[PDB]
Amino acid sequence: NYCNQMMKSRNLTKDRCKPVNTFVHESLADVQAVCSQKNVACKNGQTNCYQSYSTMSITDCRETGSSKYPNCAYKTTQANKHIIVACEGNPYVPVHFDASV
């Protein structure tokens, strides 16, 4: 599936099976734009988290209960949700995916 294939491709499951990962089907320019949108608190108290005004197409890849390295396995869940990201630096850009509301 797409998630086994994408996780492979991006070096996310070559030396370890990453439990969860979300891929955003939007232009980089448009996800970077989220850092200047709705400011919200992060799960850890900090407030350098922002929520997109709109929903974006995303694919969540959850590892199964059975999957073990080196044979990783992912459940593919496609959706459209408001992404929540944390931003840092200049230019202020996303560095961490905080969630999908």
Binding site: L28, V31, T59, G89, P94
Partner: peptide, 15 residues
């Protein structure tokens, strides 16, 4: 290695 903004893009972007 790579910066945090680069890793984010490699891990989460799929335009």
């Amino acid at each position: 290695k790579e910066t945090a903004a680069a890793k984010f893009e490699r891990q989460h972007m799929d335009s």
